[PDB]
Structures are given as C-alpha cells and as structure tokens.
Amino acid sequence: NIQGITKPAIRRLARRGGVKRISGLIYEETRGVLKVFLENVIRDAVTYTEHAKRKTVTAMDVVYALKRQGRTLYGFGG
Amino acid sequence: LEQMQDELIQQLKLQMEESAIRDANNIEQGKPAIFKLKLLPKVKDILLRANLADSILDNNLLASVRLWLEPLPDASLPAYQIQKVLFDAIKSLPIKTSHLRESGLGKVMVFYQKSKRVEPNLKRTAEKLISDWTRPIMG
Amino acid sequence: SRKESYSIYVYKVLKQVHPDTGISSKAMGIMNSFVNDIFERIAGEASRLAHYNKRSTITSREIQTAVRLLLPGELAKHAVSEGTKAVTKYTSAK
Amino acid sequence: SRKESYSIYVYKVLKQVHPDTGISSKAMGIMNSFVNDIFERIAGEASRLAHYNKRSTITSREIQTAVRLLLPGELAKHAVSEGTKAVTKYTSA
Amino acid sequence: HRYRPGTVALREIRRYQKSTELLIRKLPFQRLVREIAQDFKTDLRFQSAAIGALQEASEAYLVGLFEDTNLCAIHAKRVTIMPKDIQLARRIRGERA
Amino acid sequence: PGTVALREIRRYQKSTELLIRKLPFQRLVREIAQDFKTDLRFQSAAIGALQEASEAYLVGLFEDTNLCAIHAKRVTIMPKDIQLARRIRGER
Amino acid sequence: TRSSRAGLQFPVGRVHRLLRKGNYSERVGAGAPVYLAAVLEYLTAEILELAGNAARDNKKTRIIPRHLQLAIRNDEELNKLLGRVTIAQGGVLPNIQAVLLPK
Amino acid sequence: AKTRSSRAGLQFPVGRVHRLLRKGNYSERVGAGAPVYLAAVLEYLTAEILELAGNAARDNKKTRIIPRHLQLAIRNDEELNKLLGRVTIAQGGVLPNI
DNA sequence: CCTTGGCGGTTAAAACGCGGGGGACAGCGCGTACGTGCGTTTAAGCGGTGCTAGAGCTGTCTACGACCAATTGAGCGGCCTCGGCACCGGGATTCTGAT
DNA sequence: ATCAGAATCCCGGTGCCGAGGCCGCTCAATTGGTCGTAGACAGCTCTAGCACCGCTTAAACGCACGTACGCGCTGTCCCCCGCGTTTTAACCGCCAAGG
Numbered sequence: 001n002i003q004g005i006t007k008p009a010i011r012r013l014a015r016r017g018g019v020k021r022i023s024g025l026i027y028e029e030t031r032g033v034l035k036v037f038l039e040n041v042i043r044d045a046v047t048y049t050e051h052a053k054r055k056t057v058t059a060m061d062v063v064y065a066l067k068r069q070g071r072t073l074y075g076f077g078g
Numbered sequence: 079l080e081q082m083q084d085e086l087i088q089q090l091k092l093q094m095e096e097s098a099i100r101d102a103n104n105i106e107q108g109k110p111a112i113f114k115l116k117l118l119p120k121v122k123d124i125l126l127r128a129n130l131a132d133s134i135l136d137n138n139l140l141a142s143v144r145l146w147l148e149p150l151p152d153a154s155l156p157a158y159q160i161q162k163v164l165f166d167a168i169k170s171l172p173i174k175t176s177h178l179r180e181s182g183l184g185k186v187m188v189f190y191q192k193s194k195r196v197e198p199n200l201k202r203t204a205e206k207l208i209s210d211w212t213r214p215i216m217g
Numbered sequence: 218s219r220k221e222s223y224s225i226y227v228y229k230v231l232k233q234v235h236p237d238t239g240i241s242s243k244a245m246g247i248m249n250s251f252v253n254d255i256f257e258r259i260a261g262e263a264s265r266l267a268h269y270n271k272r273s274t275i276t277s278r279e280i281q282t283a284v285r286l287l288l289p290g291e292l293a294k295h296a297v298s299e300g301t302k303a304v305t306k307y308t309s310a311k
Numbered sequence: 312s313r314k315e316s317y318s319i320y321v322y323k324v325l326k327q328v329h330p331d332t333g334i335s336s337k338a339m340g341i342m343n344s345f346v347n348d349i350f351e352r353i354a355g356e357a358s359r360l361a362h363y364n365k366r367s368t369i370t371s372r373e374i375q376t377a378v379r380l381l382l383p384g385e386l387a388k389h390a391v392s393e394g395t396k397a398v399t400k401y402t403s404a
Numbered sequence: 405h406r407y408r409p410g411t412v413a414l415r416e417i418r419r420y421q422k423s424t425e426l427l428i429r430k431l432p433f434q435r436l437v438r439e440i441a442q443d444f445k446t447d448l449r450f451q452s453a454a455i456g457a458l459q460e461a462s463e464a465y466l467v468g469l470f471e472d473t474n475l476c477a478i479h480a481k482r483v484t485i486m487p488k489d490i491q492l493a494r495r496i497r498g499e500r501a
Numbered sequence: 502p503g504t505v506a507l508r509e510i511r512r513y514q515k516s517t518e519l520l521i522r523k524l525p526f527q528r529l530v531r532e533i534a535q536d537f538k539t540d541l542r543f544q545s546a547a548i549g550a551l552q553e554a555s556e557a558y559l560v561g562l563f564e565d566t567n568l569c570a571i572h573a574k575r576v577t578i579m580p581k582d583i584q585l586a587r588r589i590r591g592e593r
Numbered sequence: 594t595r596s597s598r599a600g601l602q603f604p605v606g607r608v609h610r611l612l613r614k615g616n617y618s619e620r621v622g623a624g625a626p627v628y629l630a631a632v633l634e635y636l637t638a639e640i641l642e643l644a645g646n647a648a649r650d651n652k653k654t655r656i657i658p659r660h661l662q663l664a665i666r667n668d669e670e671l672n673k674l675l676g677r678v679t680i681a682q683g684g685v686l687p688n689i690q691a692v693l694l695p696k
Numbered sequence: 697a698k699t700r701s702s703r704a705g706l707q708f709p710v711g712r713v714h715r716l717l718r719k720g721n722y723s724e725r726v727g728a729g730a731p732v733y734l735a736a737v738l739e740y741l742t743a744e745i746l747e748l749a750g751n752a753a754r755d756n757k758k759t760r761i762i763p764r765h766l767q768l769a770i771r772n773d774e775e776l777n778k779l780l781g782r783v784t785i786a787q788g789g790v791l792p793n794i
Numbered sequence: 795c796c797t798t799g800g801c802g803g804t805t806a807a808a809a810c811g812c813g814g815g816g817g818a819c820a821g822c823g824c825g826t827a828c829g830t831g832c833g834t835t836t837a838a839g840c841g842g843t844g845c846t847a848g849a850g851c852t853g854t855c856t857a858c859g860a861c862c863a864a865t866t867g868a869g870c871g872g873c874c875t876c877g878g879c880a881c882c883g884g885g886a887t888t889c890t891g892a893t
Numbered sequence: 894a895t896c897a898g899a900a901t902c903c904c905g906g907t908g909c910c911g912a913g914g915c916c917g918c919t920c921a922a923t924t925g926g927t928c929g930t931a932g933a934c935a936g937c938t939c940t941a942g943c944a945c946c947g948c949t950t951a952a953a954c955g956c957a958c959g960t961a962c963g964c965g966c967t968g969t970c971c972c973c974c975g976c977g978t979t980t981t982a983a984c985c986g987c988c989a990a991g992g
Contacts, residue, residue: 001439004432006808012427013463014485016420016685017470019477020413020693021484021817021973029487030466033494037465038440041458044380046444051360051376053176055132056080056449057441062457064363068380071465075243075658075681076457078250079452088218132449219870219920221607228913229602230638231656235645239655239878239912247658247680248640252633254678256611259629264617268721273931274859275617277624284632292639292670296632303631304624307599312850315712323707324742325761329750333760338749341766341785345745346738348783350716353734358616358722367724369717371733378737383775386744390737397736398729401704404697405891405899409815409974410695415900417689424659424684429807457681464679472589478692479585480573482818484973492572496565496589498781501774502829502961510794517764517789522952524838542848542942550786557784575963577828593673594868594923604868606922613860616721620859620931654878655912801988809980814971821967829960836953844944851938858931865924874915880908887902893895 002031041065083133090124093117094142102150114146114160125167134171140181143167147186155195165203175214184211223252259283277304317346353377371398426459433459469493519552526552562586595627603630643668658682701735708735748773763787 010027042057044065049057063078072078094117101111124130134140143164149155168183178184190196191204227248231240240248262283263275272279281300285293318339325334334342356377357369366373371394378390420427434455441448470485472493477485494500513520527548534541563578565586570578595605608626643664644656651660662683665671697703700710713731748769749761756765767788770776 001432001435004436005428006432008808009428012416012420013466014470015413015416016427017467017474018417018421018689018693019470019474019485020410020417023484023486024973025487026485026490029490033469033490034462034466035440038437038458038462041461042437042441043444045454046441046448047376047379048363049448050445051372052364054136055447056136056451057454059081059451059453059457060363062454062461066457066461070677071461072254072678073457073461073681074250074254074678075247076250076453077246078253080449081451081453085218221869223603225869226603226634227637227641230634231641231645233602234638234642237654238645238648241655241657242912243682244644244656244658244661247661248637251640251675251678252637255633255636256608256629259632260612260615260617263625264721267618273619274622275612275625276622277628280625280628280632284628287674289670289673292636292674296635299635300628300631303599303601304627307595307627308624310598317708320708320739321742321746324739325746325750327707328743328746331759332750332753335760335762337763337787338761338766341763342742342745345780346742349738349741350713350734353737354717354720354722357730361723362616368727369723369725369730370727371729374730374733374737381779383778386775386779390740393740394733394736397704397706398732401700401732402729404703407890407899407975408695409817411890412975414689414693414695418687421685421687424682460681461679467685474690475585475588476569476572478690479569479581483693484818488572492568493589496568496586501777502959505830507794511792514790514792517767517787522838544942553786554784560790577963591676604922610921616723618721623859796992798991799989801986803984803986805981805983807981810978812976812978813974815974816970817973818969818971820969823966824964825962826960827962830958832956834954834956836950838950838952840947840949842945842947845942846939846944847942849938849940852936854934856930856933858929860929861927863925866922867919868922870917870919872916875913876911877909878912879910882907883905885902885904887900888898889900890896890898892897 002035005031005034041069044068080133083130084137087124087130087133087137087139090121091137091139091142094121094139094146098142098145105150105152105154111150111157115157118160118163122163122167125163125170128170131171135177138177138180140173140177140183144181144183144186147183147190149189155193158197161197161200165200168207169203173211175211178211184208187211223249227252258287262286316343318343352381356380427463428459430455430459433462472497519556521552521556523548523552526555565590596630599627599631601627601630601634603634605630640664640671643671659684700732704732704736706732706735706739708739710735745769745776748776764789767791 007027010030011022013030014022014026041062045057045061048061048064052058052061059076063073063076066073067078097113097117100113104113105111125134146156146160147164155161173183187204187208191201191208193201196204224245227245228240231238259280260275263279266279266283267273267275277300281297284296284300287293288296316339321334321339321342325332353374354369357373360373360376361367361369375391375394378394379387381387382390437450437455437458438448441450469490473485473489476489476493477483480489491500527543530543530548530551531541534543562583566578566582569582569585570576573582596602599605605626608630609621612621612626612629640661641656644660647660647663647667648654648656653660658680659682662680663686665675665680665683666686700714701707704710710731713735714726717726717731717734745766746761749765752765752768752772753759753761758765763785764787767785768791770780770783770785771791
C-alpha cells in the first residue's frame with residue numbers, strides 16, 4: 001500500500017513546494033520519510049484510542065497526537 | 079461520516095431516556111406506557127444496521143438499553159416487543175467485557191434469567207448470553 | 218448535545234470590524250480552534266507563573282505578564298493596552 | 312530551611328548499581344534537575360489525558376499510558392514492566 | 405510544438421501554489437493508513453475526518469520538507485533535489501540523528 | 502596548514518571548560534540587560550547558566566554550519582551557511 | 594451580564610467557568626477573565642480584519658481558510674505567533690526562488 | 697513495612713510523590729497506585745542512567761561521576777539521547793566526532 | 795432448460811519508452827584569504843577588603859473569592875429562504891518558442 | 894523582431910445549497926448573601942552582590958609570509974523533462990459447457 005503514493009503525486013507535492021527538477025531516488029526517499037512520520041503519528045493516535053477504549057481512532061486522537069508532536073492543526077475541532 | 083453517526087446515536091439516547099421517563103410518569107399517573115412503543119420502530123431500525131454498532135459502542139447506548147430493560151418500580155415488566163427487540167439487538171452486536179463494564183447489563187441479564195414471568199425462550203437466550211459473556215473472562 | 222463554541226462571538230466581532238463580509242463554516246471552525254489554542258497557552262503560562270511565585274490565585278497580573286511573555290512587542294503592547302482599558306472600564310462601573 | 316532534593320535516593324540507587332563509584336555534587340544537581348523534569352512532564356501529560364477524557368482522578372492507567380507516549384520502544388516496555396511489577400507487589404503486600 | 409524543459413515545471417508550480425486541494429488520492433492514502441495501523445492493533449476503525457486530518461498534516465509536512473530541500477539544493481548551486489539534500493535538511497532540522 | 506587546527510579541535514572536544522572569557526561576557530550581559538530595566542542585579546549562577554547555554558547553542562550552530570559547508574563541497578564556513586542553518590532551524 | 598459591564602462581546606462567565614474547571618489554580622481572581630477576554634477579543638479582531646482585507650483583495654465577501662492562511666503568513670507578528678500551526682485548506686504563499694526563474 | 701516505599705520495595709519516597717501530586721494542582725483526585733507506579737519508573741530510569749554513567753567513568757579510570765560522564769552516557773545511548781535531545785548539560789562538553 | 799463459472803469491456807490516471815537538451819559533475823588554473831609563526835600589549839584573573847541594597851522571613855489583618863440558592867435571559871437547536879459563488883462555454887488576451 | 898498559436902484571464906448566465914435569520918426553550922451566568930483565608934503590608938535580618946584596588950601572566954593582537962582552496966571556466970554526458978503510447982484493475986455485460 002506504500003506504492004499507492006505514485007510518482008506524479010510526489011511530483012505534484014514538489015511543484016507546490018517550488019521544486020523545479022527532481023532526481024529519481026527522491027520518490028523512494030520521500031516514501032520512507034512519509035512512512036516514518038505516519039508511523040509515529042498513528043502510534044500516538046492509537047495510544048490515545050487505547051486510553052479511550054474506543055472502537056475507532058477519532059479526529060480528536062489525531063489532533064491531540066499532532067499537538068503532542070508540535071504540529072498543531074486548526075479546523076478539526078481543536 | 080462517523081462523527082455524525084455518534085451525534086445521531088446520542089440524540090437517540092436522549093430520546094430513549096426521555097421516552098422512558100415519560101412512560102414511567104404515565105404509569106405513575108395511571109396511564110399505559112406508550113412512548114416506548116412509539117420509539118421502538120426507530121430504535122429497531124437503528125440497531126438492525128450493523129455498521130452503526132461501533133458508534134453505538136462508542137456512545138454506550140447499552141446504558142439506555144439497560145434503562146429500558148430495567149423493570150419499573152411498580153414491579154411491571156416491559157412490553158414483550160421491547161424485550162424481544164432488545165434481546166435480538168444484543169445478539170446481533172459483538173458485546174465485549176468493556177462494553178458490559180460501561181453499561182452494567184449483566185445485572186439485568188441475571189435478573190431476567192432468574193425471573194419467572196419472563197418468557198422461557200428469553201430465559202434460555204439470557205442463559206446463553208451470560209455464558210458467552212463469562213467465556214472471555216475465564217479464558 | 219449542547220456543546221459550546223465561539224462562533225457567534227467571532228461573527229459579532231467580524232461584523233464589528235467588517236460589516237460587509239461573511240465567513241465560511243470551515244473558517245469559523247479554524248477560528249474557534251485558534252481561540253481555544255491561545256486560551257490554553259495563556260492559561261498554562263499563567264499557571265506556571267502562579268506556581269513559580271507560590272500563589273493560589275490567577276489574577277490580572279499573571280494574565281498581563283503571560284501576555285507579555287507570549288506575544289511579540291507591538292502586539293503585546295496593544296493587547297495590554299486593550300486589557301487595561303477594559304479592566305478599568307469594568308472596575309469603574311459596577 | 313529544609314530544602315528537598317533526591318540526592319540520598321540517588322546515592323541509594325548508585326550503591327545498588329555501582330557500589331564502588333561516587334557522584335560529584337554537580338552530577339547530583341543534574342540528576343535532581345532530571346528527576347524534577349521527568350516528574351513535571353509525566354504529571355502534565357497525565358493531567359492533559361484526564362482533562363481530555365473528562366476525568367478528575369489520576370490513576371495508574373493514565374501514568375502507564377503517559378509512559379507509553381513519552382518513552383521509546385524498549386524503554387517504554389521495560390519501564391511499564393517495572394511499574395506494573397511494583398504496583399502489583401505493593402497491592403499484594 | 406515543444407516547450408523548453410522547465411516551462412511546464414514553472415506552470416505547474418504556479419498552478420499548485422494557487423490551489424489548496426489535496427494532491428494525494430484518497431483511497432491509496434486510506435489503504436496506506438490501514439496497512440500501517442494494522443501493525444499495532446487489529447480491527448481498528450478510523451473516522452473519515454481522522455484520515456482527512458492525517459492527509460492534511462502529511463501533505464503540509466511534506467511541502468515544508470520539500471521547501472527546505474529546495475533551499476539546500478539552491479545552496480549547493482544546483483537545481484535538482486537529491487536524496488543527500490533531503491538527508492541534510494532532516495539532519496539540520498533535528499529529525500535524523 | 503590544517504594539522505594544528507585538527508589538534509586544537511581534538512583538544513577542545515576533550516574538554517568542557519567555557520571558552521568565552523567570563524568578565525567580558527558579564528559586561529556584555531549587563532549591557533544587554535541595561536535596556537529592559539535600569540540598574541538590575543544578577544546572580545553569579547545566572548551568568549554561568551547564560552554562558553553555558555550560549556556556548557552550547559553556538560556549538561550546535563557551528564555543527565549545522567559545518568554540515569552545510571561540507572554539503573557545498575567546501576571546508577570553509579561562510580556567512581551564507583549560517584543563514585541557511587538559521588533559516589532551516591526556523592530562526593528569525 | 595459581566596460582558597456588558599466591561600463593554601465586551603466575549604463572555605466573562607464562560608471564561609471564568611473554563612478557568613475554574615480547568616485545574617489551573619485553587620482560586621481565580623475577578624480581574625483575570627476580563628483581561629484575558631479583552632486580549633482574545635483584540636487578537637480575533639486583528640485576525641478578522643486582515644482576513645477580511647485578504648478576502649476583499651480576492652474579491653470575495655466571505656472568508657475561507659485560504660484568506661486566514663494568507664493573513665497569518667503575511668503578517669510578521671502573527672506569523673511569528675502562529676509559527677507551528679498548519680491550516681487545513683490554507684495552502685502556501687506564492688514563492689518562486691530567484692535562481693529557478695527562467696532566462 | 698511502615699513506609700509505603702517498603703511496601704512496594706522501592707527506594708524513592710512514595711509519600712513525597714503523593715504530596716507533590718496532590719499539592720501540585722494536577723487533578724481533583726489521585727489514585728493509590730499512581731505514586732507507586734511513577735516512583736518505580738523514576739527509580740528504574742535513574743538506575744538506567746547511572747549504569748551507563750558508571751561504565752563511562754570506569755572507561756576513563758575515574759571513581760567519581762562528573763557531568764562529563766553523564767553527557768557521554770546520554771549522548772551515547774540512542775534512546776536516552778532521543779529522550780534528552782533538547783537538554784543542555786552544564787560542563788558536559790561534546791562527543792569526539794571528526 | 796437452467797444454473798453454473800467464465801471471458802471480454804470501458805476507462806483515468808498511471809506506467810512506460812523515447813529524444814535530446816541542459817544541467818550535474820569532473821578537471822584545471824590561479825589568486826587571495828586564511829593558517830601558521832613570532833614578538834608585543836592587555837586585561838582577565840586572582841586575591842584582597844568594604845558597604846550595603848535587597849532578599850528572605852515573620853506576624854497581622856482584611857477584603858476577595860469560594861459557595862449556596864434563586865432567577866431569567868442568552869445561546870442553543872430547528873428550519874427556513876436567498877444570493878455568493880461555482881461551473882461552463884465564448885470572447886478576448888498574452889506569453890513561448892520557433893522562425 | 895515578429896509571429897502563430899497554446900494558455901490564460903476574463904464575462905456572463907445559470908443553479909444551488911449553505912450562510913444567515915428567526916422562533917422556542919433550558920441551563921448556566923447573574924444576583925444575593927455568607928465565611929474563611931490568601932495575600933498584602935510592615936518590619937527585621939543578614940547574605941551576597943556590587944565596588945574598588947593591586948599584582949601576575951597567559952591570552953590577545955598586530956604583523957609577516959606562504960599556500961591551498963575557493964571560484965571561474967571548459968567539457969562531457971546522461972538522465973530528467975516533455976511527450977505519446979500502453980497499461981491496468983474496479984466493476985461491469987454477454988457468454989459457453991455441464992447437470
């Protein structure tokens with residue numbers, strides 16, 4: 001499911017970031033970085049969900065997990 | 079999607095509690111309990127929907143289910159339709175030990191099992207459900 | 218579920234500053250989250266200051282110095298001006 | 312004035328770990344700062360969880376999940392095991 | 405005809421710094437999230453808003469990282485971003501040791 | 502050229518003692534503090550903590566600057582490397 | 594109401610209750626919630642002023658998250674204040690580096 | 697076993713931690729095993745750090761632990777340095793790294 | 795005759811091969827800016843003594859905030875309708891690269 | 894420089910669905926009064942922080958000298974961009990062979 005992040009999507013993200021030329025290994029590097037980020041955030045969110053005993057991870061679990069990292073997000077009930 | 083289901087289930091919980099209070103007052107006022115019967119179709123339709131079980135467990139609607147199943151102070155049992163529908167819903171949902179702890183439905187289940195005015199089929203179903211719920215605790 | 222928010226107050230403030238301008242619901246959500254965040258920051262700083270100074274009370278002095286600690290120079294100055302103005306106007310009457 | 316510090320406890324732990332080693336005064340200051348800092352972190356996170364879940368009591372579950380959030384994998388596992396062992400034996404005794 | 409390489413690149417840069425819509429397809433991201441989550445606890449749900457928030461945060465993070473990477477690449481007097489640029493940016497941020 | 506510099510690097514990495522002179526640093530701190538409130542007093546441990554924090558901060562900044570300079574295939578650190586480091590750190 | 598007495602639009606009772614139920618101090622003085630409400634009202638007024646300006650600049654009569662993001666990242670003091678927050682559907686500022694521009 | 701530390705087999709003070717948790721304005725109520733659990737965790741972590749600090753002081757042929765050895769122990773342990781990555785140690789120096 | 799399991803459709807980025815240009819990278823050369831060494835001035839540092847502002851502590855005394863209790867209106871939920879804006883095709887610019 | 898022609902902004906008419914406004918009510922903020930103490934205030938102690946002065950000497954510094962490294966310039970090429978062709982897998986309709 002990590003191959004669902006296609007090369008055009010990474011190209012689009014780099015173009016919105018202002019990148020003009022892209023190497024060929026950037027895609028795998030970005031997939032690794034994204035996997036690490038998502039692993040940490042989802043681990044925190046599932047920890048919160050386990051404390052809550054809920055059958056879903058809620059948006060509140062994600063918002064508190066991002067506040068835990070310092071990535072405060074507005075517009076999801078915070 | 080699912081925040082909305084939780085809100086709707088909470089609204090259903092409030093409606094169920096209000097209907098139970100109204101029916102209890104009406105019985106105390108010399109009138110039959112009709113509000114529970116009126117709300118029964120919507121509760122049945124909501125409970126029969128399987129994908130909403132997770133949201134039901136996240137809102138602990140089993141507390142209101144037990145409140146409806148709790149016999150009124152006049153020592154009068156609830157309507158047989160309500161008991162049958164609630165038993166079917168309880169069978170239809172994956173109740174775990176945490177949900178029972180949140181709701182405390184085991185006490186009412188034991189009361190139903192011990193009681194004799196309860197239908198014998200409901201008695202057998204209560205015994206089966208109590209055994210199934212004791213299964214995970216002992217292994 | 219009667220849950221509270223700041224939407225009506227944000228709308229009143231908007232119509233006080235910009236009469237002919239509306240706001241989307243997603244931006245109202247973002248503004249509510251922003252208000253809650255800033256409240257939490259200020260209250261945490263005030264609590265830490267009170268515990269440093271061995272006091273059981275959160276007064277306006279703690280709020281003022283937390284504002285000074287948190288906001289940048291001109292912004293903090295204007296905010297302190299506003300807060301002092303409001304406190305004196307509220308205290309002068311009753 | 313009787314100032315409170317964790318110095319004697321660090322001596323006890325050190326002798327338990329390294330009987331033939333000593334600690335300087337500055338290293339004890341650092342250790343005291345570390346202990347106070349960790350206590351502050353854990354208590355603040357426990358309070359945050361309690362408020363998140365509309366609770367007015369700090370039980371060992373909140374502390375356990377705070378340790379789960381703060382510590383990394385192996386550290387979290389060992390510290391959770393140690394804490395559960397100690398709580399179990401304190402309850403039993 | 406044919407454009408100079410980098411003209412469509414700048415057109416795309418202008419187009420994507422204007423819009424705000426999510427640049428990842430929803431189902432692949434949901435499948436990735438569920439695949440990752442399945443390694444911590446089986447039978448988890450996520451709310452759709454939890455996936456939306458995760459996608460917003462992940463794209464914002466990746467765009468900031470790509471901006472730092474672009475800064476590093478321009479610092480090295482180049483135009484093509486490279487994995488060593490990413491590693492240097494993540495090291496300077498304090499993310500990789 | 503480049504051997505006594507490495508020897509000094511090794512020497513100074515083996516040690517912990519503060520590198521900025523203590524009294525010039527005290528005077529600098531007082532001069533900076535003279536803007537926020539006139540005629541302030543300072544504890545000695547306050548100045549010591551300030552010097553430790555300042556030197557730790559500067560060493561980290563020089564680490565990042567060295568990383569950038571090596572990235573540029575150089576060995577000399579230049580002010581634009583400092584600027585890039587402070588930009589990426591998020592410093593204003 | 595206590596908002597009227599202070600000439601305010603934000604609630605004083607709500608803020609006092611949130612400070613009371615937030616486990617912040619044993620007791621809360623009466624001048625803290627008024628001051629804090631005034632600060633919050635000032636900051637939201639500034640934010641909404643710049644966001645309305647940004648929305649008129651785009652010729653829109655309703656504020657969306659994009660205008661909030663532009664107002665925040667375009668104001669130095671606010672952007673320093675909200676330095677770590679990400680705004681959903683806020684986008685990024687248009688910024689093309691000097692060396693990437695064509696020749 | 698009078699002291700609560702003894703009843704839990706600990707060296708840190710359960711009573712002081714209880715007092716600080718109560719007289720600290722964290723929550724309306726406090727459990728009975730939260731102080732025990734936290735004291736156990738704190739004692740474990742201090743032992744973890746002191747082991748590596750003793751190792752580093754023994755690798756330098758020194759009997760006393762100084763801030764240098766604490767710095768070495770923290771910056772050499774992957775998990776501790778990740779825990780303490782935003783912490784400055786006074787007189788800790790740097791790690792030899794060329 | 796029918797149920798049964800099967801093969802061929804359509805379809806929207808994405809996967810892929812390709813030309814070829816321009817950019818990354820390597821090599822070279824040189825000039826200066828920085829390292830290295832040396833003799834010289836400076837003030838940090840070390841030590842001493844002096845003076846005292848102000849910090850830490852204590853005891854008193856009251857106004858302020860916590861707490862109950864009664865009360866009513868603001869803020870909530872429901873629900874309604876209009877217009878701000880999204881979308882599309884046409885009209886009209888205006889840049890791109892080619893000449 | 895000039896140009897056609899790809900991209901773009903622009904205009905306007907059409908739909909809609911969400912923002913805004915409005916009624917009903919209930920719960921929380923507001924009024925009223927009562928108590929207890931947290932903290933303001935004053936007064937007292939005495940540590941330590943500032944202040945200066947003398948003496949020492951290692952560190953800083955000014956300077957000289959040289960070279961190595963940074964920066965500009967040339968060349969090579971190869972691997973990204975821009976593009977068209979092929980692919981694919983979610984879910985669908987029509988189909989053939991055995992009971």
